[PDB]
Design a protein around this nucleic acid. Sequence first.
RNA 1: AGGAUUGAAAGGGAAUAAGAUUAAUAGUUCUUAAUCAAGAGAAAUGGUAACAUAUCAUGAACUUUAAAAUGGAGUGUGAAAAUCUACGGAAGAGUUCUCUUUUCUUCUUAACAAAAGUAAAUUCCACUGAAAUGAAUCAAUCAGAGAAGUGGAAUUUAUUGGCUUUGUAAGAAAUUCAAUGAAUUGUGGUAUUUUUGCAGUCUUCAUAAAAAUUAAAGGGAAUCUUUUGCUCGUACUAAUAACCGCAACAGGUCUCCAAGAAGCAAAAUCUUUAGUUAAAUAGAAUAACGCAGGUAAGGGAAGUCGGCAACAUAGCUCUGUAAGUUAGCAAGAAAGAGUAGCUCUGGUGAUUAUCGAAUCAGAACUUUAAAGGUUAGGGG
Lengths: 105, 87, 73, 50
Amino acid sequence: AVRVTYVRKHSYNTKSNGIRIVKTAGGNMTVQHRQKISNGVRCGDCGCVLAGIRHIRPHQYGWLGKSKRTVTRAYGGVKCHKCVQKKILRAFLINEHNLIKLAAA
Amino acid sequence: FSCTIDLTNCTDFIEPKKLVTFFRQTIKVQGRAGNTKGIEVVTITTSSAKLCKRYMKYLMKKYLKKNNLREWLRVISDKKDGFELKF
Amino acid sequence: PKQVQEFKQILKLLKSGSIRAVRVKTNGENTKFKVRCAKYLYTYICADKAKAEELKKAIPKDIHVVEIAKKAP
Amino acid sequence: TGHKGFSYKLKLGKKIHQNRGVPQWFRMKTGNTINYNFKRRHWNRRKMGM
RNA sequence: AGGAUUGAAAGGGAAUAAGAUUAAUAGUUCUUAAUCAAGAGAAAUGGUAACAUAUCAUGAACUUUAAAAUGGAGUGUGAAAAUCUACGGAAGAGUUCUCUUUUCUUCUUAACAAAAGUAAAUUCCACUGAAAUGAAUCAAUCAGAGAAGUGGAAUUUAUUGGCUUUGUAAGAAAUUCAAUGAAUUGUGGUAUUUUUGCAGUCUUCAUAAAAAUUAAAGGGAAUCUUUUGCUCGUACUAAUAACCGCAACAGGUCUCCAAGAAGCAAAAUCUUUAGUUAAAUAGAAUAACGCAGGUAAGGGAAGUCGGCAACAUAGCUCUGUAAGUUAGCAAGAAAGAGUAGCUCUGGUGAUUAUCGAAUCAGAACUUUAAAGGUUAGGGG
């Protein structure tokens, strides 16, 4: 086995100091710096992970294409489809009830 | 499969005729030395039996040690499924 | 580095005025046409000798051409 | 330390520069008593405390 | 519009790798190949849907949401690396008068991107509507606020998109050969460990950070090439000699990487890669008294304040286990038997005849009669 050494000057097994050891030409093994695991997005109401958006670092979303950081729907990217459906019915049914209850009952 | 041995600079040290009988009487085709009926005997050119190039170097190095001449001669592959002998 | 897939793009790349250098490598099985552009190094794996010659004529004479073989320069 | 401030590094460099003996010509001056630098130090003998 | 300064070289954080080079520096130099930031040259489609489209396809004020940004335990499992191993080889080395188709070494590949082929897990969408209730895990857990089935969508899996593969890229590097030039660089495993993710389960009178910074939404105000990237640290030790103890002090001082044997074990013991043979001087003789390690006939605590010290037990399997008790324990109670080598036999699966795992049980024979080299409870 080939034993390796930290390349940067950090010497502690911190979250930002994660490494990967990969093989390299000549049988030597080198040290990489791996990225932290991130969370995605959550519905503003039900707190569920949204589908269609990758789990990357906050700044890396700007690098992605304009269509790859959202979902093409009303409140897309901030509310789940189930979250949105309840919003539409609430807005329509309550308004319709207001027209019959009050406003020339 | 056809292994070829070159002695073009050491045939005086080792006559081929002595090598032909040794390979015939020492190859263990099925664990038995001397039962090499499917061996064409310096070349070996045998297809019925299974052998190896690295096996050929084994007896040849064994042969050199038997004659106490191993300290002078070295068996080197000629990159053409054969072996050539140097000093 | 990027890899171009079919023959149409490389000629359009060769005829484009963004080229900087060309290096041709001959392997035991195929021939690679690495085009050194401003940003990337596009390459094209070719296994047909006649199509390779068509490519070599497509190279403008002004650009520098480097031929690589079993011995590196 | 490998890491140091710029001003601290320069003060380190001066202490290296001041750790030298008397040049030979200065020792041949007439009426010269300064033969050895008594302010000298070595890393393993006295820590300069800075 | 809302609250000033400082406070982390282990918290948050835009973006770089492989090879080569020096007497000494190198994610810093060189070759090659990349990335990032700041600049310069009445306004889209598709899908039933989950949602998808090399920049595309306008989006101000104001407001909201999310990320950065969240404990621990234990179980299962995906992938990579190391070790081991199956088949096929190529080159070199070791042994060789006794044998050995033999034993050992090399057979490699980066950042960043591509998308032939092909995965595991979770969550959603469409059709349908479950009772004779079904579906599933090692465990769970779930269903008319809709299970199972079939067909789809998304996310995660150390960069693009997880793995093989591809560009980089063989021109490098490794192993050989010749005297700079030549050769090779397959495919696998229902094995172990490590690393890294994922899934649910358990636990708290414990619920296990904030900002810089980024994106999205609601609203409708308005009508590819190229330049530059400043300041400071960067040598060396990091300890049985570079640090703190007056010193080259058997004391103390926070971390990363981690091979084989054997074993439950990162234990003791031995070895490979690397390091070293010197670390406050030696030679001769082999008295007493010592310090450290031992043994001893017969007796067995009679020694002593006192079994102090030492001796003794010691692993695993099977049988067996009392009084007392807060009913949980005591308990490894106590006590007894087995254990080696060699030659065999049988049980536990996968895939559909071939292949594979260490584990358990049993039987003849032999001997110096078997845990004991090391590790390893004295009991009442």
